[PDB]
Amino acid sequence: QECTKFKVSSCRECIESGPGCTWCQKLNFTGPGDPDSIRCDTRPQLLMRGCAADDIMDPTSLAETQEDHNGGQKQLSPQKVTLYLRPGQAAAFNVTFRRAKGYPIDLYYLMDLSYSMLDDLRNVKKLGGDLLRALNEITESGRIGFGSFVDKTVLPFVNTHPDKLRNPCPNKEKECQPPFAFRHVLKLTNNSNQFQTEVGKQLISGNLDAPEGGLDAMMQVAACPEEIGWRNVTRLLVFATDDGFHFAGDGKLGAILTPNDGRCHLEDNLYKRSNEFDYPSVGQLAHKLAENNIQPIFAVTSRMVKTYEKLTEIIPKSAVGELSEDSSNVVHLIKNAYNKLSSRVFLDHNALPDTLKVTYDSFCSNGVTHRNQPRGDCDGVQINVPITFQVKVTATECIQEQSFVIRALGFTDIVTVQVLPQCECRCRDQSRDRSLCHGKGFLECGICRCDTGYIGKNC
Amino acid sequence: MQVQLVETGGGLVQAGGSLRLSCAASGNINSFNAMGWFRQAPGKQRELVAAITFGGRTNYADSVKGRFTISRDNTKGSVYLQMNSLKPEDTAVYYCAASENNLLTGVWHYWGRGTQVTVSS
Amino acid sequence: FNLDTENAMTFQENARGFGQSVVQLQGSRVVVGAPQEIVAANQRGSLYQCDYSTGSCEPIRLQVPVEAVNMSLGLSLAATTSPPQLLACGPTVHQTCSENTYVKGLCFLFGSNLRQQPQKFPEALRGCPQEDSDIAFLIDGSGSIIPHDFRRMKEFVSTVMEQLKKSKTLFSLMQYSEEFRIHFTFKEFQNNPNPRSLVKPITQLLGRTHTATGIRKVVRELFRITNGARKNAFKILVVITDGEKFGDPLGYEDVIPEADREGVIRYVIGVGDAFRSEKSRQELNTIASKPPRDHVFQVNNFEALKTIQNQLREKIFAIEGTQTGSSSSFEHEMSQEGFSAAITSNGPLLSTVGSYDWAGGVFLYTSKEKSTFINMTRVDSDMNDAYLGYAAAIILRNRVQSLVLGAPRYQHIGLVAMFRQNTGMWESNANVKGTQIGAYFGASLCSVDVDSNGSTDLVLIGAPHYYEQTRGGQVSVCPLPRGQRARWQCDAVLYGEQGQPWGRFGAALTVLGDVNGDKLTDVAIGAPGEEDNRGAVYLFHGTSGSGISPSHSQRIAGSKLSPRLQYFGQSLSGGQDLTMDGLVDLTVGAQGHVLLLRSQPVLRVKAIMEFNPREVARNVFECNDQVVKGKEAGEVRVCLHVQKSTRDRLREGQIQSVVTYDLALDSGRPHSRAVFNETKRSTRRQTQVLGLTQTCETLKLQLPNCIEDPVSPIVLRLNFSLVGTPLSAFGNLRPVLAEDAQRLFTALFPF
Ligand SMILES: *[C@@H]1O[C@H](CO)[C@@H](O[C@@H]2O[C@H](CO)[C@@H](O)[C@H](O)[C@H]2NC(C)=O)[C@H](O)[C@H]1NC(C)=O
Ligand SMILES: *[C@@H]1O[C@H](CO)[C@@H](O[C@@H]2O[C@H](CO)[C@@H](O)[C@H](O)[C@H]2NC(C)=O)[C@H](O)[C@H]1NC(C)=O
Ligand SMILES: *[C@@H]1O[C@H](CO)[C@@H](O[C@@H]2O[C@H](CO)[C@@H](O)[C@H](O)[C@H]2NC(C)=O)[C@H](O)[C@H]1NC(C)=O
Ligand SMILES: *[C@@H]1O[C@H](CO)[C@@H](O[C@@H]2O[C@H](CO)[C@@H](O)[C@H](O)[C@H]2NC(C)=O)[C@H](O)[C@H]1NC(C)=O
Ligand SMILES: *[C@@H]1O[C@H](CO)[C@@H](O)[C@H](O)[C@H]1NC(C)=O
Ligand SMILES: [Ca+2]
Ligand SMILES: [Ca+2]
User: Fold this and answer.
1) CA–CA separation, C45 vs C37, rounded Å?
2) Based on the domain organization, do A135 and A284 belong to the same domain?
3) Where, in this chain's numbering, is Ca(2+) 2 bound (chain C)?
4) CB proximity under 8 Å: B 82-121 to C
């Protein structure tokens, strides 16, 4: 390869000078008596000049596998990797993903109850076991829940006049509910009969502006796992609406300037604290969804499809489906959304320092081969079909010891990757009375280093 | 359009005496505008002696000026004829007429059946 | 890089919202709004005046109208330095009409002083929309109207009454001839709401066309509360005439002014061949309300009355609402005027974010009697819910002013458009869209004149909710087009420091002018969400070439200033001197706290190292083998000049500074070829207090005679460190050496 040397006083400084630099530690190799920086060079220049690869010091970057041994086979292996990184040399280790049989699906159906969703509300009340039956078709022990949402209860998001706070619907309607931010209606249950009675009591509502506070409700679903009752396995959040959504900064119009804190504020299963906090941002919600492993399914109407399709870049584990303006849409769209979510696997890492660089090569079953990618990306993933992701990690300096995790998005599995440096030539300890050059120093890979003796020999 | 006219007030009266004729219209006040009184003496045709618009403009024949007064009350759908200083030459069958239109000399389709006024010398 | 952090002056008061809007006044004062302070019931928001000398803030007198209820005054602010003015807006006035409330805006244009009550903008609040409509008809019954056409006119009235009775409508009709004929009142329509039942038995009048007196009896007798007209209702009269007034004792000069004092809006349907002449059509224009084109149309015969009734339904609906149907598109109502404010030279502007179902719009009260309302060209559902006007800024094109607007919600992606006027017509010059969904691109706008040409070179667009892993906001560098008709294209992008993904970089932007004395305008960008909402402010220098430097020069964190700071950088205002020190000050807003950062004068150091014995002379290489010591004279001259890179109105005679000399001879070799007079090694360190005049010091070097043969010249390196002594006046304000100042200097002495 290539090696450049300047002002090299040690074996360590030689290895730091480039990934192609090697060091011979032969005694009295400096025949002319000239500077000892000549000792650092490439392997073939030194190998022809009297070194035979044992005298050559060449530390190389390494990957170690310490996979946990247990009965069965987890869906992501190896589980622990140790890397010794030399600056300029990449370490490669290869990670395998094997889709399991799926898990008991938790579907929380968070529904718009604006007046344009009136005919949608009648059908969703009567869906009941059909939602559970579709969940029980893919995986066993499915479990369903319900929530509802209108915008925040201040101007201009709703009409705050007391006559219209009582009936926000059009004046001829009198099966109408007052406006509300978020109501948790049904805790997650396999009992379709409690779904029918509790959703059946919910009345349609109305608001003033077209965008609504659905993202504010999605934050409360993700920030209140005990009230929603999220089992860890296959968290899914159906988001049905026919309008746009407010997001952070919109609350300034209602003089609401405190940012969303990401906390749970369900009191009496109502987000009565919506007037106190602003709407969340997209990235704020996307962070909380990835922590709690909740994958949204956006069931929006046709005029909103291309708008919510843009969210899939910021929320990687999300899906968009067309709603039929009466919720007569097939739960096959909800079923196909889960199939699109399950065919897409993303392999990514957390925040890294500027010293470390990570690439992923993605080998996929019917999803083609990718290389040098910022994140792993495979499509067409099938159950019990292994796929393989090649991680290459490169350090640009002698890094301090550190660890980071690689996680498959949509899943709780983690590959813990500990990174250690490889800059020491690991030379043999001398510091002995027999090994004293002119009475001072020690051998130190063939360099007699001065013991702060100032004027003298080899100093 | 259906309008029916009935005369109320006719009878026998002495010369120099007085008599008031009245008539109600059996229909919509919006369905007729101008009203008038005709009289038919023996041997003669029907003579318009007093007519009134809906707003109260009047016209009188010269033979009855200073003696007869036509007046109306639109709240009762009625028009009136106060006949003072009656003469034997005023003996006639008097008709009320009404028009769908508001002219004093045109289209008197609606007619009462008339009432007899006889003035004795 | 020269904003004083240690000697910062913090203002504080207990009022909810204090720090949510700051603006530098000219005369050493900072006006801050506290939009959520409940000074009294049915009032919200107040304003305070903070002076640099008196370290406390004082409230501002509030001339609030009675129905400016829950106003949140102080949310938006703007001021002009050259004419002393202050524009304070509360854009949440609540008008609780019966069955609806509305959120509108109200502003105040103060002058040089504050006990003078300002010019109210708008002077009149837009008001309660009138409730329910009283529609009267006035139909010609002249003998000119033939009987078949008269029933066509009756059928016209019946169908229009059938079409206009959506809900809560009262109707009346009066024929008009020689005499005038009340067929049914509003009360009679309310008891029998069947138009055909009321219209069919009507018979035609005949005679002279007394149009003027008929209008008078409509205003007096027909529009009368004893006949069922409702107070504060819409009063509409539709006159159907043959258009030739004859025989009426009254002219149009009499009855039309009394029709207008009662507020009766007049529509005229002109029927027949009478109006083929233009003179007769002008008489129709006399009857109707202005403009005549909306209120007058001509039909060739009574069978053509059917043609106008299709459009007349839309025209009469238009008063209640134009093409509205259900889910009404609210226009100039729900507007929240003054949500963003700015003061154009011609007049104060204020944005109506909630105009045309929150599509956004901007008022321009140049004289207040004319209101120049400005949104974009295309009218579609795409523009709905855009919140345009949420950041409003002005640009200067050769000292002629134009306008830029921000719509952070255009299809849930941000949008910024420019407007210029063309002979009184404000048209959209260009537009720039965002790319990150939910980034709120265009929430903050900032026009930058780098060279101070009078020509704005650059518009800073902020996307504070842009989420890019560690980063938590973005500012787009978007230069104005030169005029080649190229679409407006953003050349660069400014990020914040990595590590705060929810930092909201770009939420508030300001121009502070030249702080470092480089003749180029510098900018500041606030990130009030960094360090878990303990915000920070970044400073970016201007660049030659009319750009902004991609890397910031000074990051001022709100944690270091005070532990109890929060949202440091939510409001920014710079460009003026507040301390009268000639130093461009900068005010920052936080939650409950407003603090001003003073600019430090910049100094640069010039080092000259000159030797008269720069000649080698090479006498020393003839040593007579005696004991070798450093011999011969060592004349040296080391002058340091420190000068000001900044112009201030200080006296400039009190600029003291302390500098530390470090000198080294033949560095980089194991033993040097020279030593000094005193130390007997190759090292020197001197401290010396220096003014702005050149202080020069001669030294003595020592050269041993016989040394290595002359190959390499002797070098004398100098690294230094400058600490400016603080001023006795001006609040102990410390001069600071420039960031890019060269701090190493090498001297040449040949061998
Ligand atoms: C990842 O697994 C692949 C096999 O699927 C390994 O790649 C092969 O490496 C050998 C060298 O040992 C080459 O000859 C082949 O051409 C490679 N094949 C492909 C498809 O890349 C690779 O070594 C593994 N990565 C590791 C261990 O880091
Ligand atoms: C803004 O107007 C509203 C009107 O609803 C006020 O809010 C409520 O006012 C009633 C008055 O009887 C109180 O009983 C409630 O307690 C108020 N609500 C709350 C949450 O306190 C409100 O006070 C007005 N704001 C100001 C500043 O006057
Ligand atoms: C921009 O401003 C214009 C004029 O102020 C708006 O035009 C009005 O549009 C409504 C649509 O409902 C019509 O009913 C009105 O008759 C129009 N007024 C006119 C032409 O004077 C326009 O809607 C505004 N908004 C957009 C997005 O263009
Ligand atoms: C001149 O340069 C020298 C060399 O860098 C500076 O000495 C350093 O000082 C710092 C502060 O004490 C130490 O952390 C370094 O270890 C020192 N390095 C060496 C090689 O001594 C010195 O501070 C500089 N002086 C001035 C006035 O700039
Ligand atoms: C299913 O429902 C029954 C009651 O209907 C409940 O007792 C049981 O725990 C539920 N099981 C699961 C796996 O949800
Ligand atoms: Ca500058
Ligand atoms: Ca100053």
Assistant:
1) 5
2) yes
3) 514, 516, 518, 522
4) 100-103, 106
